[PDB]
Amino acid sequence: MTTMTVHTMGVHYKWQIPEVLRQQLWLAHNLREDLVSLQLAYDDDLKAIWSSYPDVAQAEDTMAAAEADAVALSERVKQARIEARSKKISTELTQQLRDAKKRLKDARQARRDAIAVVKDDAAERRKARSDQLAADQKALYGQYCRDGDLYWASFNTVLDHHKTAVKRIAAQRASGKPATLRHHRFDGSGTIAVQLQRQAGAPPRTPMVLADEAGKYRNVLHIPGWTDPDVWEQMTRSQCRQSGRVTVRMRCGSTDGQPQWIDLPVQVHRWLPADADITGAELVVTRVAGIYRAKLCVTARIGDTEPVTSGPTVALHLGWRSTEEGTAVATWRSDAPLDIPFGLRTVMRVDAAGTSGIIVVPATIERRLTRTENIASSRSLALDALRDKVVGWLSDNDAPTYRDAPLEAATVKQWKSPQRFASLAHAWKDNGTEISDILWAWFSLDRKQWAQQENGRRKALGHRDDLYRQIAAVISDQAGHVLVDDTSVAELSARAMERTELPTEVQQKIDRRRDHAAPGGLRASVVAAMTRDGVPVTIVAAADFTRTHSRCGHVNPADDRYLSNPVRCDGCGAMYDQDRSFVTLMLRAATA
RNA sequence: AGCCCAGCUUGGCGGGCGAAGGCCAAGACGGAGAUGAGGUGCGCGUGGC
DNA sequence: TGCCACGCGCACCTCATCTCCCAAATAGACA
DNA sequence: TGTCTATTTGGGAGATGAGGTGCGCGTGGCA
Ligand SMILES: [Mg+2]
Ligand SMILES: [Mg+2]
Ligand SMILES: [Mg+2]
Ligand SMILES: [Zn+2]
């Protein structure tokens, strides 16, 4: 029963966001901002509690001095790098910088120890501050829901999300990595939640309950026209799409104490099992190219799938090397031959034996992403030209009032986002001057290019993601066991730009290719499919695998020879591919 | 040429250029939140040139 | 066998991991 | 006065710590 899942329904594009929904999203954003402000104040108060002790104060002073020295040396290193116009500077500067950084790290560790020794004596004060924070959070519910128009489900969703975020931040800071809460800017996107409570001894919240007009949750969430998945899968796609158009009635908070409901015309492609247990739903609103889209996600608790027992073992390895037919994003090997559909044979390549292959991404995705980049360049150039023309007209002509104030060239000149120019075009749409035409002929055009720059991009990414899911599907259809390497793409991405031996532009191109390939997404999709379909997954400790030659079992030195393929070995004196060897070593390690 | 026209990806037919108008076929489908990174684009400085 | 340009400013996007997906007590609307 | 519906609430916990990142894992060809 534990297996959670989400079924999504796409609201009709000919549906305008009601005012109640907009107010609900605004209230949710304000509530999260208030929560973040409270959390930051609480953090500052805790740090003030820590700084009260004398030993911690002395450690803080030492750490501050060390940080000042480190930042000064970093500034000098940056200046020397700028002067030399390269990354090769005097070795003395690097040694001074390393020594300063080591001293700073030691001072920070000393501060941590000073906190640790006096940790037990501040427990009462920290508990008191935590109680004050909880009281303020309760007052937020009093203000936003008891005396406000925010639905209690949305408040609870936001509060739970925030508490999970602070738990994650504390866990990260415990390891030694930086993390902090940040203020986001509202734009019109958000989420509104509905919760289906089930008390002790209550009947399951099956999908058949939600379809009833007079059900237990008729005034919380109503999804009419539920069809059994077995019957649903027999119908033709025409009937499935005609019958899947329903009108979901959803609670949408209050308005001056008066509860309100919204009717979303949604299109449903799949239904939930008759034994599901709907735990809740959420309507998510997003802006893509300044256009609002809505989607209703319903969460259900379904039973688990019996694990598989037989099947070939498939080992997967991640890379982002470049090939004439696209980026080769993965390399897979199998213990027994696999069966790949013919429609995927150009993406999930296989060998004659059927036990090995490479997963590559079509070059059309990269071409479309490059097209989006070109569109962005053209948009920026046109925006700059418009800025120049508007500033000139403002200087040489009279300034009609904008935002109930005269327009000053200092403000217009420093405008950088296109949102300001779009707003000025809207306000002066009926201005009647000439700068109202020049400022509209731009905006209209920019409303067509912008969409493309976003829309096409999404398509490309979607295409890639789709293919990945397809690939994952086939593996879960046959594999009795799947092995994945423990490569951390995030750590590599974070540390790549600082210790690269290549020029900045080459590393930028490599990182862009890695981002477009998205190896981590492919691995995540494979793991998710295996988990859903009951296939076991094993994360292999992949340390020292590309430096090991499978045929001879010798470990080559890390002399950066692995920057190209094939790679020369020292034990046997032969050139070997470092990814076939990787997957072979993974299979050997697992099959032991 | 692109983007859009009942969820998403890929195709076919018929349309729209910020508005219109949808129909059909195959496939896959676990979402949200936060954080941390990365990338692109346009300007500026410094040089080499 | 050595080289490929080093830093800012803002604006606007995606990628990589990780967690979580409630229910009891109390109050109201109705007959 | 008694069934269902809707909202309020307390969780859920025991409670140090933020600036990574040299372990590998990935990624270079051109003159
Ligand atoms: Mg490899
Ligand atoms: Mg569509
Ligand atoms: Mg057409
Ligand atoms: Zn060898």
Author numbering: 1 to 592
Give the text the authors published on this PDB structure:
In state I, the target DNA forms a full R-loop containing a 17-bp heteroduplex, whereas, in state II, the target DNA only forms a 12-bp heteroduplex, and the displaced NTS is disordered. Nucleotides G1 to U17 in the crRNA and dA1 to dC17 in the target DNA strand (TS) form a 17-bp guide RNA–target DNA heteroduplex. Unexpectedly, nucleotides dG(−3) to dC(−1) in the TS do not form base pairs with G18 to C20 in the crRNA and instead rehybridize with dG18* to dC20* in the NTS, suggesting that the 17-bp guide RNA–target DNA heteroduplex represents the optimal length for Cas12m2-mediated DNA recognition (to differentiate between NTS and TS in this study, an asterisk is used to denote the NTS). By stark contrast, in the full R-loop, the REC2 domain is ordered and interacts with the sugar–phosphate backbone of the heteroduplex at the PAM-distal region. This structural rearrangement of the REC2 domain facilitates formation of the Arg-rich pocket between the REC1 and REC2 domains, allowing the binding of the displaced NTS. Notably, the central region of the negatively charged backbone of the NTS is bound to an Arg-rich pocket in the REC1 and REC2 domains and interacts extensively with Arg111, Arg112, Arg126 and Arg173. At the position corresponding to magnesium ion (A) in other Cas12 enzymes, we observed a magnesium ion that was coordinated by His317 and Asp579, whereas no density corresponding to magnesium ion (B) was observed.
A recent study demonstrated that the type V-M (formerly type V-U1, clade 2) Cas12m2 from Mycolicibacterium mucogenicum (hereafter referred to as Cas12m2 for simplicity) exhibits RNA-guided dsDNA interference activity. Cas12m2 associates with a single crRNA to recognize dsDNA targets containing a 5′-TTN-3′ PAM. Interestingly, Cas12m2 lacks target dsDNA-cleavage activity, probably due to the non-canonical His–Asp–Asp (HDD) catalytic residues in the RuvC domain, rather than the canonical, DNA-cleavable active site Asp–Glu–Asp (DED). Hence, instead of target cleavage, Cas12m2 interferes with invading MGEs through transcriptional silencing by strong DNA binding.
